[PDB]
C-alpha cells in the first residue's frame, strides 16, 4: 500500500504534480519493461524500413502503414479497458472491505468473558486467538505474501497463532476442502462452554459474541469467494488481446513515413512518436493497473499489507482481551463537569 | 470455475500474456465455431465476387460493399453490448453472493444444541441436513448440473440428503409450486421442539439459529428470483441482432475490393481481414461471455462448481455438528503468554 | 415473466440465436406497430418525392434530405437512451427485490405460536393472513393486474384474504390515505395478545415475529414508494422526443435520392433502408423496453406475475402455519450416520 | 410529485406519446423561459447579420460563424452533463429512501406499550408524537415547503406537533446547532420510564422500540447530511458553464449564412434551426432536471410532497397508537378453513 | 463545506446562473493559478512564434502546430478523467457516510444508564466521552484540520476529550500501531462494570449500547481504511499526465497560425483561444475537483467541517447524557386528543 493521502489534503497549485516524482507504486515502475520492449520493436521496424528495405518494399510498407493507421480505430480498446478496470476496482475495494478486523469481537471478549484469574485470561486469549487463527488461515489461502510467511501450519505454530494441540486437532479433522472454517466452530463450542461454566453471565452476551464471530466468518467467506471466483478468464484474454493488438498495429501504422513521398498526414518526419508513446502510457498503464489490482493480496507496491494487518490484529487483540480486561482509567470529572 | 488468481498475484512483465495460452475457460473455446462459420461465409463471398460474378455484377457488388462499409457505424454494437454485459456481470456476482453457505448456522448448531448422546447427535444432524436439503432443493431448480446429478427427489434420498420419511412427507405436502421452502418450516418446528425439550437452553439461542436459517432462506429466495426473473428477452434479442447484423454487414462491406479499380480505402488488397477478425474477436467474444455468464449455474468452464459446493457444504456441516460438538483442543497458554 | 434461463444454461453454438424465434415477450411484439407506422410514413414520403414532386421541388427535397442526414448526429439519442434505460433497469430490479415473501415470517409463525387446538390454528392463520392481506393491499395499489383481479375490498373478502369483520374494521378506520399499513398494526396487536395469552412462550419470539413483519412492512413501503415516486416525467419526455425526433429526421434524411443526380453518398439506390430499419430496431426497441419495464406491475409479457405470487404466498403460508405446525417427518439416522 | 405510473403500466402503441401532452412537471414548463431567451438572442443576432452589418462585416461574421461551428464539439457537454445528472439522480433517490416513515415504530408502540386507560393513551401518543416531532424538525430544516408551513417552532405548537411544555424545554436546551435530535433523547427517556413503570412488560420490547427509533434517527441524520453536504459547487459551476458556453457558441455558429456565398454546409437557408433547437431542448432540459432534482425538497412540481407526508405520518401514527391499540377485528375462521 | 441547497430549492429561470458569482468553493479559486500559468506559457509561445522565429523556423513551427492539433484526440483525457472522478466522488460520499455520529449511542446512554446522583452522571459522561474520544482519535489521524487543532494527545487533554488518567493509561498501552481502538475496549469494560454494578438493569440494554458502540467502531475503521488505502498512485499519475500532456500539446497545436499562409482551419486569426480556454476550464477543473475531493478531510472550502462536527458531537452528547437524563417535558394531552 502506497499512502499519499496527507500530500493531497488540500487542492494546491500542482498538487498532483508532486506525485509524478515517485517510484514505489508508480506507473513507470509498472510500465518500463513493456515500454522498453515497445521502443525496441518500434525502432527495429523503423531501421528495417529506412535502411534494409528496397524501394518497392518501402512503397509496400508505406501502403501497409497507411492501411494500419487508417483502421486503428476499429479496435475498441477504451470500451473493454474501461469495463475491465471498473470491474477490477469494484472487486478490489470489495476485497478490502471484507478483510476481517477483530476489534468489535475483541471488545466483546474483553467485556463479556469475566475472570481476572489465569483461567479467564486463558479463555479470552483462546477465543480471540481462534478469531485471529481463522483470519490468518483464510489469508494464507488468499494471499501469496502470507503464504510465503507461513508455508505450512507448523509455521503458524511457530508464530504463536496455533498451539500444537490445535495443530493435531486440525490434522485429525482433515478433509479435501479448505479448513479455515474450523476455528469458528471452535469459537462457538468454547463460548458455549464458557457460558455453561459461568464465565459468561448471560446468553445475550453469548449471542453478541457469536454474532461478531459470524460477521468475521462472512467476511472471510467473501475473501475465499473472491480468491476462488476470479474475473472470468475470457475478459482478461479479450482485454489483453485488445491492448496487444492495438499496439502491435501501432508498431507499423504509427511509423514515420518518408516525407519525400509527401503522404497526407506524414509531412513532418519526427524521430520520437510522442503521441503514440503517450497512448502506450495511458492504455498500457490502464492494463497494468488492471494487472496489479486483479489480485490485491500479492506483493505489489500497491497491494495490501496483509502481513502487517495479521501482526497488528494479533497484537492488538491479545492486548485488548488480556491486559485491558477490567483495567480502566480512573473515572474522574472532565473539564466540562457542571 | 477457472481459477488463475495465483498467476496474477503480482503485476510482472506480461502477466496477462501467459493467460493467452489457456484452453479451458478461454475465449477461443467459446469463439472457434462462430469464427469458423464467419470465416467460411466471408471466403465463400470472396470467391463468388472474385470468380463467379460478371464484371457488371462485380461493379454492383463493389458499390454495395462501399455502401455497407460506409454505414457500418450506424449500428450501436458497443452501446447495447456494454449495457448488456454490465447487467450480466452485476447479476452474475449477485447470483454468486446469494449462494447459501451453512457455516454460521452449523457453528450455531454445534454450539447451542446440547447433548453428546445419540439423540442430540440425531437432532443436530437433522437440523443441519434440513439446511443442506433446502439448499440442494433450490440448487436442483436453479442449476442444470445439480439437476443432472439429481433428476428426482429419490436421487436425493440415495445421496443422503433426504430420508424416505422426509420424501414421503414432501410428497404428502405437494403443491403446484416449488417445494424448496419446506425444510425451513421443518427447521423452525424442529428447533422449537428442541428448545421445548431442553436441548436448547435459552430461547435467545433459538432466535440466533432461526436468524441464520432465515438468512439462508433469503439467499435461496434470491437464487430462485434470479432463476425465475431472467434478463428480459427483448434485451437478449436486441443485442444478438446488433452483433449478428454488424458482422453480417461486415461479411460484405469488409471484403477486399479489386485494387485495379483504385477505390479510395481499397488500394491494398490483403487476403486476411485482420482488423475485421479482431473486431469479430472482441465483439462476438463480448457476446459469448454474455451468453456464458447469463446463467452461471450451467456446465460451462467458467460456471460455478455447484456440485462441489453441495458436497462440501454437506460434508463440512456434518463434520461440524457431529464430530466437533464439544470436541475442543486442549486449552493451553500460547507463545505470547505473559 | 418470460423465462428462458434453462435455454441459456450453456454457451453453445448460437445460444442466443434460438431466442430470436420467440413471440411472447419478444421485441417484434413490442415493435411491430411502430415499425409499420414508420414504414408507411417512409414509403409515403418516398412516393411523394419520386412521383408527386416537380423537378425543382425534387431538388429542394434533395437539399433538405442532405441537410437532415448531415445533422442526424446532433441528436444524442444514445446518451439519454442509455441513462434512461440504466435507471429503468435499476429501478426494475429494485422493485422486484422489494416484493414481500412471507416465508421467514410463516416459518416463525409455525414455530413460535403454539397450540394444536382450534384456537392456535385460528391464531396462526389470522397472523399469516394479516401478512398476506397487507401484501395484497399494497399490490392492489401498485399493480394493475392485481387491481383488475380485486377491484374492491369486497373482492378481497370473496377471495378469502379479508373477513367481513376485517372489512368492517377497515371501513371504520378509513382515512384519505392508503390503508395498506393497517394489517401490520393488527399483526402487532394480535401477536401481543398471543404472547400475553401464553401462546407465545417468550417475548424474544415475539420480537422475531415483529422483526419479520417489519421487514415485510419496509418492502411494501418501498413498493408504495416506487409506485408513487415515478421517474421524473421530464426524463420520459426528453427521451421520447429524442427518439421521435431522431426517426422523424430519418423519415426525410434517410430517403434514397435519385442516382442520376450523382450525389455523394447516394450513388446506389436501394428500396429498403436496411441500416435505417436496423437503427429503428435498436433505438426504438430500447425505448420500448424502457416503456415496458417502467412499470413492471402491469400486464406485459415480461411484467411480474404478481397474481401468481399472491396466490402462491397465500397457499404456501396457509399450508405452512396450519398443516405443518409441529408436523415433522420421523427423525431417523441418515445415510452418513457413523 | 407527478405520478403517471398507471398510464405506463403496459407498453402500448405510443405509450410515451400521451405523456408529451402534459404541463405540470413537464420539460416545457422548465424550459420555456430559457428557450424564449435563446430564441430572442438568436433572432436578434440573425437580424443584425442580415440587415445591420456591412458586407465586409458580414464576411467577418461568416468566418466567425464557421470558426464557432467547426469547434462546437470541443465542449464536452455530454460528458459533464451525464456525470452530473447521474450523481443528481443517485442522490435524489437516496434522499427519498431516507425519508422517515414511523409505521414500524408505531406498530411497536401500539403493541408493546400496554394500558387502555388515559395514562397509556397519553404515553403512546407522546412517544409517537416524539417520533413525528423529530421527523418534522428535520424536514423543517431540509425542506423549504415545510419551513414555509412552519416558519417557527410556535407554528409547530399551533399544529399539534409540539406542546408548550416541549417548546419551553427545547428553548431551555438551546445550542448553536440544530435541535432535531432532542425528541430522540426524549423518546429514549420516556420509553425507559415506561418500562420502569410497568407499561412495557419486557426490556426486549424496549430494545425493539429504541431500535426502530434509532433507525428513524439514522434516516433523519442522512437527510440532514444531504441538506448540509451538497454536490460540490465546482461541479455545478462547471456544468452550467459547459451548457451556457455551448449554446452561446450556438448563438453564432448555428446561424444560417447567406446561400449566395455558397459556403459548404450552408447551401440551404432555413429560418428555424430545428436541430439547434432540439439540441437546446435535450441539453438544457438535462440541465434543468439537474436543477430540479438537486434539492428535491423545494416546491417544484416533481419535488416531494413533504407536507403531505408530514400530515399523513402524524394522522396515521395517532390513529395507530390510540384507536387501534388492542382493538382487533373478531378472529373468525377464513374461507380456506379446513 | 459550501452549502447552497436553499438557493437551488426550486428550478427557476437561471437557477444555476446565480451560483457562477461565488468565490468560496468556486472553480475559479481552484483554477486561477493554473490558468495564469497556461495563459503565460501560451502567450510566450505566441510571441516567440510571431516575432522571434525566422521564416523557415516559422514554417517548421506551423507544421509542428498542425501535427499537434491533428493528433490532440489521441489522448483519452475524457475516459480516464471520468473514471477517476467517478471513483473519487464515490469514495468521497462513502467517507462522509462513515463519519461517526454518537446520537443513537447517546440516546441509549441517556436512557439505559440509570442514576441521577453524581456517580451515574459520571458514568454516563465517561461512556459518551469514550465514544467521542475514539471519534476524535480517528479524526486526528484522518484529518489534517483536526490534527492541526490537536497536534498531540495533550491538546486533547486540554480540550476536555481526555483526562490525564486516560492519557497516562494510553501512554502505558502504547504499541507501534494507531491507538484509536482503545476507547472502544474502555467502553466495553466500563459498560460491563455498569451492568454488574446495577446501573444497567438488564443485559439487553448492555447489548444495545455495545451494538451502537460497535457500529461507531465500524465507521471509524472505515475512515481509517479510506485514509490508509488511498486511490492507487498509478491512477493519479496517469490522469495527471493525461491532462498535463493534453494541454502541453494545446500550448503548441492550438496556436493561431499566420492567416497569410492560408492554412486550412487557420483562416481567422483571433488573439484569445476561447475554445481552448474553455477546454482548459472544463478538463483542468475536473482534475482540480479530483484533487479537492481526493482527501475530503483537509482544509479546502468544500472539505468537511470536521472540527465543527467534533465540537457539535461533544457538546450535544454531553448535553444529552447529563442534563437530559430523566428530564422530560410534562406529558400532557396534545391538540388532537379525542
Ligand atoms: Ca497484485
Ligand atoms: Ca452458463
Ligand atoms: Ca409494464
Ligand atoms: Ca427542487
Ligand atoms: Ca481536500
Swiss-Prot record, chains A, B, C, D, E:
Effect annotated for changing residue 226 to C: In RP50 and VMD2
Reported regulation of activity: Inactivated by sulfhydryl-reactive agents.
Residues in compartment: Extracellular: 51-59, 255-273
Catalytic activity: chloride(in) = chloride(out); hydrogencarbonate(in) = hydrogencarbonate(out); 4-aminobutanoate(in) = 4-aminobutanoate(out); L-glutamate(out) = L-glutamate(in)
Location relative to the cell: Cell membrane; Basolateral cell membrane
Chief site of localization: membrane
Disease: Macular dystrophy, vitelliform, 2: An autosomal dominant form of macular degeneration that usually begins in childhood or adolescence. VMD2 is characterized by typical 'egg-yolk' macular lesions due to abnormal accumulation of lipofuscin within and beneath the retinal pigment epithelium cells. Progression of the disease leads to destruction of the retinal pigment epithelium and vision loss. Retinitis pigmentosa 50: A retinal dystrophy belonging to the group of pigmentary retinopathies. Retinitis pigmentosa is characterized by retinal pigment deposits visible on fundus examination and primary loss of rod photoreceptor cells followed by secondary loss of cone photoreceptors. Patients typically have night vision blindness and loss of midperipheral visual field. As their condition progresses, they lose their far peripheral visual field and eventually central vision as well.
Subunit and interaction comment: Interacts with YWHAG; this interaction promotes the ligand-gated L-glutamate channel activity leading to the positive regulation of NMDA glutamate receptor activity through the L-glutamate secretion.
Recorded family membership: Belongs to the anion channel-forming bestrophin (TC 1.A.46) family. Calcium-sensitive chloride channel subfamily.
Listed name of the protein: Bestrophin-1
Organism: Homo sapiens (Human)
Gene: BEST1
Residues of the full protein shown: 2 to 339 of 585
Amino acid at each position: 500500500t502506497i499512502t499519499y493521502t496527507s500530500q493531497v489534503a488540500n487542492a494546491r497549485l500542482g498538487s498532483f504534480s508532486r506525485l509524478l516524482l515517485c517510484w514505489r507504486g508508480s506507473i513507470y515502475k509498472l510500465l518500463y519493461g513493456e515500454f522498453l520492449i515497445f521502443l525496441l520493436c518500434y525502432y527495429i521496424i523503423r531501421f528495417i524500413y529506412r535502411l534494409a528495405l528496397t524501394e518497392e518494399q518501402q512503397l509496400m510498407f508505406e501502403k501497409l502503414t497507411l492501411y494500419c493507421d487508417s483502421y486503428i480505430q476499429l479496435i475498441p480498446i477504451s470500451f473493454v479497458l474501461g469495463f475491465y478496470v471498473t470491474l477490477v476496482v469494484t472487486r478490489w475495494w470489495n476485497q478490502y472491505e471484507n478483510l476481517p478486523w477483530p476489534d468489535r469481537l475483541m471488545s466483546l471478549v474483553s467485556g463479556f468473558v469475566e475472570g481476572k484469574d489465569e483461567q479467564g485470561r486463558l479463555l479470552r486469549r483462546t477465543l480471540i486467538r481462534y478469531a485471529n487463527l481463522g483470519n490468518v488461515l483464510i489469508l494464507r489461502s488468499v494471499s501469496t505474501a502470507v503464504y510465503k510467511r507461513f508455508p505450512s501450519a507448523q509455521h503458524l505454530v511457530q508464530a504463536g497463532f496455533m498451539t500444537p494441540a490445535e495443530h493435531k486437532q486440525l490434522e485429525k479433522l482433515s478433509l479435501p476442502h479448505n479448513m479455515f472454517w474450523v476455528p469458528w466452530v471452535w469459537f462457538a463450542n468454547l463460548s458455549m462452554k464458557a457460558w455453561l461454566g459461568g464465565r459468561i453471565r448471560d446468553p445475550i452476551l453469548l449471542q453478541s459474541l457469536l454474532n461478531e464471530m459470524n460477521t468475521l466468518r462472512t467476511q472471510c467467506g467473501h475473501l475465499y469467494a473472491y480468491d476462488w471466483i476470479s474475473i472470468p478468464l475470457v475478459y482478461t484474454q479479450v482485454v489483453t488481446v485488445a491492448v496487444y493488438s492495438f499496439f502491435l498495429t501501432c508498431l507499423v501504422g504509427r511509423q514515420f513515413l518518408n516525407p519525400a513521398k509527401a503522404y497526407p498526414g506524414h509531412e513532418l518526419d519526427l524521430v520520437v512518436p510522442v503521441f503514440t508513446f503517450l497512448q502506450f502510457f495511458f492504455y498500457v498503464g490502464w492494463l497494468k493497473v488492471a494487472e496489479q489490482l486483479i489480485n490485491p493480496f500479492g506483493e505489489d507496491d500497491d497491494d495490501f499489507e496483509t502481513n502487517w494487518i495479521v501482526d497488528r490484529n494479533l497484537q492488538v487483540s491479545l492486548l485488548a482481551v488480556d491486559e485491558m480486561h477490567q483495567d480502566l482509567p480512573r473515572m474522574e470529572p472532565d473539564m466540562y463537569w457542571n
